[PDB]
Amino acid sequence: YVPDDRVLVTETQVIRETLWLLSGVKKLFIFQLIDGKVTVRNNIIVTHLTHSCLRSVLEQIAAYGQVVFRLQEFIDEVMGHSSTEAPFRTYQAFMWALYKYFISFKEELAEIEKCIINNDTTITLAIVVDKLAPRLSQLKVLHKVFSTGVAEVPPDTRNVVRASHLLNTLYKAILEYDNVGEASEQTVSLLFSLWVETVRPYLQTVDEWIVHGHLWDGAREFIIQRNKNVPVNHRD
Amino acid sequence: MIHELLLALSGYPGSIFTWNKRSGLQVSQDFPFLHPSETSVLNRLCRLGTDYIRFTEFIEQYTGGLHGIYLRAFCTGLDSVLQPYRQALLDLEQEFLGDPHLSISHVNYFLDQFQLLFPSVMVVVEQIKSQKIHGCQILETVYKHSCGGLPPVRSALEKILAVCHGVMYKQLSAWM
Amino acid sequence: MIHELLLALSGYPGSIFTWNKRSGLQVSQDFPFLHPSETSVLNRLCRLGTDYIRFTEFIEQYTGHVQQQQGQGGLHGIYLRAFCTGLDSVLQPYRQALLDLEQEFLGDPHLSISHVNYFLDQFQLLFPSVMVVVEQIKSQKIHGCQILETVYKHSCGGLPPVRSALEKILAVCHGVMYKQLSAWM
Amino acid sequence: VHDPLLAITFELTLRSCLYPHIDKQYLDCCG
Amino acid sequence: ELVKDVLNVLIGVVSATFSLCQPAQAFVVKRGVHVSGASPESISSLLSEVAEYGTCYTRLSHFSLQPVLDSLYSKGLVFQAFTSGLRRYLQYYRACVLSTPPTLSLLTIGFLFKKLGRQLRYLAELCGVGAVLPGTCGGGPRAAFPTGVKLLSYLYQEALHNCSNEHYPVLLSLLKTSCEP
């Protein structure tokens, strides 16, 4: 048999690679991405790990890596980094809440990194993987919500359709997870926070139009499109 | 070996412990490093790991066929019964990191309390799959084995069952 | 690779971070000692420093550079000066954030770049948003009070932090508008 | 106003404490 | 460690320098170029901005320090009042420079003093002397500073021009003192 050349990276370095991947980072030597599909690098070996089991766990992290990468890409697209005065105003609220969640997740990853760098305490792949288990539970639900709200129709031409659809896939999935039980109460709380900080723009538009009496929206965001409001006041 | 196994018992099978649909995690090789008969010990131990992949699959697909909110609650409970089986595989590695002479039989002994909870929860899960007990009759198949008699699996199925009542006490508290 | 980061983000390049006017701040992209994983993180951080340098340049260009000596809204104006005055004060918390970072790095001598990424990730979103606000003024040569509208229309941004940040600037510029109204009226 | 009343399986009922705001606003506005 | 010098570079010292000379030919501030002791180029550049503040302090301090001498025929009584008020400000600026902690971090010193640095550079450019020798042009121009009613009026038009900006209190104080004669 002919042995195959493999990089022989250290197991400790692998957790550092996983941690920066789980935070917003690209072009890591582990988890090489090719077409927006983060995939475990073909040849990595470690001392106290066989190739196959290492591939299996690394792929299992990379599956979550794809979710975090796509959410980061969406956030990047609508952070202002990129028309003339086209504030979507609901996609921005949704990404803002998503960003808050990603900040807290990044804080937990930062604490783990600090523990990894300076101590004699052993942090290995199994320890960290099972330590992030509550966050990993959140990420899959978040991926489903995003993959239905924003990726249902890939061409996604119309804008009022996008806004209504996103609000209506949050209001629906909260009902779906409302009666799963009182077992964790984690998923439902996450989804509810997303809903509140995604409906804030619509209800601001409401309250403004309610008391100040002038409907005020751009990109045809709101559902009662005042397409005919421009000239009708002339008729009396 | 003692890290490949302390991960193969977890989800990730590896080359040594090849996974197969008909039977899961059966290492089948003649190895100089392992003692000849240690495979048999490893087979008995891999029953536990095989079961673990089976539950993990089952929780994955939920949370035409089976569907409901109760399969989104039984599986959440099946995560909690398995939580002390994850922590108890972390602790094994923590001990094995330091002690360099400790052998497989400590894995056997330490993970021997999980050869009573798991086999008799597996019959519950295969019952729920072979018979499409989708709705409120899931409480029946949990309460029918919760009488039990083997205390590890009599309290395990109790943790599972109480969650299902947690769903039923909000479905029948919205109603009342 | 640690203290140099704070220097560059403070907005003065080092040999490791070559400033080119075209590419802003840019890592050399080739050092055998560091693996490519950290490079991308560094570039992401450098985007913020690039925006800070561009901001400081524009501010220096149009505020206090002359004793009021071609006067024109794009070129000069009390409102333009007010915008610069607001921009630097809105950028002040970035200054304070970098300051607290240096204190904590004095406290601890081995801190990963991810920690810096965290503590600065809130400005990572605010700075790009303000960039278009300045960019439209430069491109459209916006004149006089029309800057007030230009910032107001981005006051409907769906980012609450960006909204409050720009609101501060509009308060400052409403300062000068109210001031000119305070003589004629 | 939604958030204060929020801060004190009851999800539809949670939404049911957000409609009386519209009802009051319309009650003042029909006036 | 080197920062102690920089703290006193805010004041006139010799560790860093204000050679009263033609910009960058003999005019100098101590710097390490190419080979240096634990001083990558960026450190020198940061020291260079603090140096800009330092040169402005030294030039402005000379401009105001030069007293009437009791035979100031070229300038006026009102210019003498102007210089007195300016020195009042300079004394306050020196006091803040002193009030800086001796133990402070390298970046933090400059970030702490940014606002006062730009304020002072503006004040320098307000006067011809401070405007002259900016570092981007020689000492040759030597722009004539107005004196008398010309000076008073020039100050007031600058007050109108720069009314709204953060720098206006300084101008108001100078004008209050200057008008008294």
Swiss-Prot record, chain A:
Transmembrane segments: none annotated. It comes from the Eukaryota. It is found in: Cytoplasm, Cytoskeleton, Microtubule organizing center, Centrosome. Widely expressed, with highest levels in heart and skeletal muscle and moderate levels in brain. Belongs to the TUBGCP family. Component of the gamma-tubulin ring complex (gTuRC) consisting of TUBGCP2, TUBGCP3, TUBGCP4, TUBGCP5 and TUBGCP6 and gamma-tubulin TUBG1 or TUBG2. TUBGCP2, TUBGCP3, TUBGCP4, TUBGCP5 and TUBGCP6 assemble in a 5:5:2:1:1 stoichiometry; each is associated with a gamma-tubulin, thereby arranging 14 gamma-tubulins in a helical manner. Gamma-tubulin at the first position is blocked by TUBGCP3 at the last position, allowing 13 protafilaments to grow into a microtubule. Component of the gamma-tubulin ring complex (gTuRC) which mediates microtubule nucleation. The gTuRC regulates the minus-end nucleation of alpha-beta tubulin heterodimers that grow into microtubule protafilaments, a critical step in centrosome duplication and spindle formation. This is Gamma-tubulin complex component 5.
From Swiss-Prot, chain B:
It is found in: Cytoplasm, Cytoskeleton, Microtubule organizing center, Centrosome. Ubiquitously expressed. It comes from the Eukaryota. Belongs to the TUBGCP family. Component of the gamma-tubulin ring complex (gTuRC) which mediates microtubule nucleation. The gTuRC regulates the minus-end nucleation of alpha-beta tubulin heterodimers that grow into microtubule protafilaments, a critical step in centrosome duplication and spindle formation. Component of the gamma-tubulin ring complex (gTuRC) consisting of TUBGCP2, TUBGCP3, TUBGCP4, TUBGCP5 and TUBGCP6 and gamma-tubulin TUBG1 or TUBG2. TUBGCP2, TUBGCP3, TUBGCP4, TUBGCP5 and TUBGCP6 assemble in a 5:5:2:1:1 stoichiometry; each is associated with a gamma-tubulin, thereby arranging 14 gamma-tubulins in a helical manner. Gamma-tubulin at the first position is blocked by TUBGCP3 at the last position, allowing 13 protafilaments to grow into a microtubule. It is linked to Microcephaly and chorioretinopathy, autosomal recessive, 3: A disorder characterized by congenital microcephaly and chorioretinal dysplasia associated with poor vision and nystagmus. Variable ocular anomalies include microphthalmia, retinal folding, retinal detachment, optic nerve hypoplasia, absence of retinal vessels, round areas of chorioretinal atrophy, and attenuated electroretinogram. Most patients have mild developmental delay and mild learning difficulties. This is Gamma-tubulin complex component 4. The lineage of its organism: Eukaryota, Metazoa, Chordata, Craniata, Vertebrata. The gene is TUBGCP4. The chain holds residues 1 to 191 of 667 of the full protein.
UniProtKB/Swiss-Prot annotation, chain E:
It is found in: Cytoplasm, Cytoskeleton, Microtubule organizing center, Centrosome. It comes from the Eukaryota. It is linked to Microcephaly and chorioretinopathy, autosomal recessive, 1: A syndrome characterized by microcephaly, cognitive impairment, underdeveloped retina and choroid, and epilepsy in some patients. The more anterior parts of the retina, near the periphery and pars plana, have a grayish hue and diminutive vasculature similar to retinopathy of prematurity. Visual impairment becomes evident during the first year of life. Belongs to the TUBGCP family. Component of the gamma-tubulin ring complex (gTuRC) which mediates microtubule nucleation. The gTuRC regulates the minus-end nucleation of alpha-beta tubulin heterodimers that grow into microtubule protafilaments, a critical step in centrosome duplication and spindle formation. Component of the gamma-tubulin ring complex (gTuRC) consisting of TUBGCP2, TUBGCP3, TUBGCP4, TUBGCP5 and TUBGCP6 and gamma-tubulin TUBG1 or TUBG2. TUBGCP2, TUBGCP3, TUBGCP4, TUBGCP5 and TUBGCP6 assemble in a 5:5:2:1:1 stoichiometry; each is associated with a gamma-tubulin, thereby arranging 14 gamma-tubulins in a helical manner. Gamma-tubulin at the first position is blocked by TUBGCP3 at the last position, allowing 13 protafilaments to grow into a microtubule. This is Gamma-tubulin complex component 6. The lineage of its organism: Eukaryota, Metazoa, Chordata, Craniata, Vertebrata. The chain holds residues 351 to 531 of 1819 of the full protein.
